Subunit: 322 residues, 3 copies
C-alpha cells in the first residue's frame, strides 16, 4: 500500500491536465512531476495485471502504430499496452510526403505511435499531426519510452535514484555501441538529472558522443552532483564493471558478459539489456540473479500502459487513487 506517492507530492490530477494530449518525442519532453506520475501509474498497472484485475482504463480510444523498421519487443509491447487498456490499434509496418500522411492519419485516430529509422521525420509528423505522437524510435536519436521503463526497472532495485541525496549515488556502466545506441542516449540524459555516476565502456569508433557527455555534465552540474569521478571511460569489462549498481549492455567479441566476468562485481548489481541480444550476454547469465533484462521487457508493458493512460484518459475513471 506504500507507493512513491507516500514519499513525494504527486498531484496526479494537475499533472494529467499538463499531460493531456502531450507528445513525447525526447526524454526532455518529460519533467520531474511527469516522471513521478509515470512511475507511480506504472506501479499501479503492474499491481492490476499481476492480480488479474480489470486493466481496461482507456476503452474506446483508437491509436495508429506506424513502424517503418522491424521492432518486435517495442511494437508488440505498445500494441499490447493499447489492447490491455481496452483500446484498439490499426498498424503500419510499411510519393506521399511525411506531413500529408500525418495530416490524414491524425483525422482517423486519437494518437500515433511512430518508429522511423530517420531521426528527422518525427519532428515533421509532430507539426502536421492534429494528434499527439509517441516516439517509439527515430534511429540513432532517442527512445523515450525505453528510458522510462529502464528508469522504472532501476528505481525498483535502487529506490534512492529519486532521493537526489549527495551521499546516495548510483553508479551505472553502459557497454557496447554508445555512439549509435539511442537507448544509451535517452537513459544517460534521464539518469544525469539524478545523483548518478557513468562508466562508458566501448572501443574508440563507438565511444559515447561528446555532446551526450556535455548534456550529462550540464545536468549533473545543475543539481551539484558533478565531479571529475562523474564520467570515467574504459577499454575493458574488468576496469569498467567495478562498483556499478547497474550494468546496461547494448547490441552492435570485445565486451561479452559471462558468469566468470561478473565474479568481481557488487553483490547488489542488476544487469539490464533493452534487447534483442546476439553474443553480448552468454545464456548462463540468465540463471544469475543479477540478470533482470526479462523483468525490464516486462516493465515495458506497465510503463507504456501508464504513459498511454496519462496522455489520453479522463476524456471510465482512474488507476489514480492518486
Amino acid at each position: 500500500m506504500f507507493y512513491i506517492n507516500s514519499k513525494y507530492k504527486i498531484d496526479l490530477d494537475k499533472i494529467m491536465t499538463k499531460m493531456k494530449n502531450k507528445s513525447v518525442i525526447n526524454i526532455d519532453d518529460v519533467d520531474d512531476e511527469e516522471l513521478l506520475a509515470i512511475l507511480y501509474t506504472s506501479k499501479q498497472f503492474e499491481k492490476i495485471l499481476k492480480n488479474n484485475e480489470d486493466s481496461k482504463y482507456l476503452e474506446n480510444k483508437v491509436f495508429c502504430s506506424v513502424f517503418l523498421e522491424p521492432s518486435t519487443a517495442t511494437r508488440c509491447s505498445f500494441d499490447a499496452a493499447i489492447l490491455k487498456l481496452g483500446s484498439k490499434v490499426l498498424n503500419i509496418t510499411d510519393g506521399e510526403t511525411v506531413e500529408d500522411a500525418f495530416k490524414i492519419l491524425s483525422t482517423y485516430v486519437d494518437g500515433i505511435i511512430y518508429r522511423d529509422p530517420s531521426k528527422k521525420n518525427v519532428d515533421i509528423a509532430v507539426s502536421s499531426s492534429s494528434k499527439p505522437i509517441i516516439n517509439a524510435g527515430n534511429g540513432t536519436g532517442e527512445h523515450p519510452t525505453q528510458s522510462l521503463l529502464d528508469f522504472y526497472t532501476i528505481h525498483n532495485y535502487f529506490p534512492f535514484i529519486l532521493d537526489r541525496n549527495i551521499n546516495k549515488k548510483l553508479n551505472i556502466a553502459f557497454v557496447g555501441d554508445l555512439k549509435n545506441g539511442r537507448t544509451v542516449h535517452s537513459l544517460s540524459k534521464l539518469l544525469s538529472r539524478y545523483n548518478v555516476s557513468f562508466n562508458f565502456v566501448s572501443c574508440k569508433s563507438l565511444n559515447i558522443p561528446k555532446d551526450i557527455v556535455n548534456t550529462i555534465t550540464y545536468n549533473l552540474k545543475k543539481n551539484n552532483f558533478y565531479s571529475d569521478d562523474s564520467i570515467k571511460y574504459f577499454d575493458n569489462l574488468e576496469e569498467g564493471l567495478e562498483d556499478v549498481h547497474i550494468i546496461y549492455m547494448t547490441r552492435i567479441n570485445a565486451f561479452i558478459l559471462s558468469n566468470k566476468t561478473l565474479e568481481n562485481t557488487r553483490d547488489d548489481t542488476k544487469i539490464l539489456h533493452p534487447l534483442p541480444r546476439v553474443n553480448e550476454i552468454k545464456v548462463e547469465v540468465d540463471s544469475n540473479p543479477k540478470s533482470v533484462y526479462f523483468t525490464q521487457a516486462e516493465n515495458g508493458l506497465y510503463v507504456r500502459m501508464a504513459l498511454l493512460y496519462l496522455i489520453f484518459s479522463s476524456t471510465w475513471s482512474h488507476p489514480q487513487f492518486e
Copy 2:
C-alpha cells in the same frame, strides 16, 4: 429529411442489408440519400464526442493487395469507432495471397470466418469473382483502373456539403466540375463521373492525349444527362490545359498521376508537371470553387494552396471516416 427529401430509413435499410457495393451503379438515389443522411449523423456524433458504437461485435476482413493509407486506414477506423473488429491482409502481391489457389476458393473459405470483406486488388476482374463465390457482402475499396465507389460517396458528400443543389435536379441550378490528371486510370474519376452524371452537372475533362477519360465513361455520362434532360453539346468539354479547363467550375477534382503505370519516367515526368495547381492558377476561378483530391498527392497541388479557403481535400479525407461508418452501418446492422 435532408431538408426537403424524406428517407424512410426502415424501408431503405431492409433494401441495403447484405448488399455488396462493387460499382457506384450498385447504389441507387434513395440509398445515396440514406448514405448522405447517416454520414452527417456520424459526423455530428464524432464532433460532439458522443457514443458512435452502433455496429458492435461484427468481424470484417480487410484485404488490400496493393498500397493504401487514406482508404485502408479510414475503413479500419470506421470499423473500430462503430465498435466492430477487423482482421487485415497486407500481402503486397495479389499472387502471394492466392499462391496457386483460385480466387473463388479463397473467398468461399474467407467468407465462412467473417461478416463482410473490404477488398482492394490492382486487378479489375477479381472482385467480380470474389462477389460470385463470397457468402458475405464485399465492399470494393478499388479494382485497378475500374472504380472506387466509397471514394464517389465521400466526394459527393463533400461536394453536397458546399453545393446542396446537386440533389435538386433543377434545370436552372447546374454544378460544373473540372477533372484533372489521369482520367484513363483514375478509378476515382470513373466512380464520381458516373455518379455526378445522374444530376445537373457539366464536365471539363483536363488531361494529356493518352490519359483522356475512357470513351465508355463518356457514353455513361451522355446517356444519364439525356435521361434527365440535362444534356447539351456544352455538357462535356475536353482541355489541353488549366487556363481553359478551370474556367467557371464549382469543383476542381485533381488526381495523382500514376508513376506505378508508365514504361518511361520522361513519359511520366512530362505529364506529372503538366497540371500543377498554384494560387496564381486559382486567381481566375469562381469565388465559391472548392478543390478536391482523393490523395495521396505529389506535384499536382503546391503546398501554398493548403492555406487557400478554396482547398477542402483534408476535409474530404476526414469525411471518408463518416461515409464508411455510414455505409458499414446501413449494410451490416441486424433485426
Copy 3:
C-alpha cells in the same frame, strides 16, 4: 464432465495431436458444437472476453491465420500479429500476452518456443508435419456426419479412403493417428512411390491393436479410385504437392492420377462425405461442389468452431 477436463486443459500447450487424450477430444468436440449452435443462430458468442494473444506466422498460411484471428475476435478477445535467438523472442513476447498461436516451417523452432514461453502455445502447422487443429476440425467434420467414431462400438466401424500424396500429406498422417484411436478401417489410394509411409501404417496398427479393433481388413492399399472408394463413409482428398518435387517433370507424371469427378462418385455410398483440407489444385473438379457429398467448405467452416472451442478450453479463468 466439462470442469474436470477444463482444469486439466487450463494453460495447456497443443503442439502434437498425441498431446490431446480421449477426454480432451470429447470436451473439444462437445464445445466446438456449442459454438456452431451459437454462431448459426446469431446468439452472443463472447465467452472469452479481455484476453490478449500473439499470432506468429513465419510462412504463408492465410486461411489458418485468418481462422484463428476470427476465433479470437468472435470469442471477445484481441490478437496482435507477426508476419514473415528464437528462445529470447518467446521469453519477451510471452510477458505481453496470454497465449501464442505459432506457425513455422522449421521443425526445430516450435519445440524451442514451447520451452522458453511462460504462456501456452497452440501449433498452427510446423516442420514435424503436426497440425493438430486441422486434425481436430477434420475429426469434428467426420463426427458431424458419423456420431459413432466416439462410441468405440465393435459393431459400428467407420471406413475412410485417403487419396493422393499420402507420402508428403502431413494432414493425412496426423488424422490417421487420431482416427486409429477408434473403430476405423483405412483404404490408402495412391501410386506406389507416393504410398502412405511405412511407419504411419505402424502407429495405426498399434492403436487399432491397443483397442481390440485390428483385423486383416483394417488397412487396404489401392491403385485407383474405382476400387479405392468402394464401401467408405469418408473420402479425404489431398494437394499433390509440386512444392516437394525438385524438377516439375517427376511431379507431372504423378499429379494427374487421382481426380475426383461425379462419374467416379456414382458407385460410392449414399451417406459418403468428401473432405479436403485445401487449398486444392482441381484434383476435385468444380462439378463436385454442387454434389451433396462434398463437405470441404463446411470443413473449413468447422475450423472456426474448433479453434474457438480450443482457445476457450485452454484460457478460461
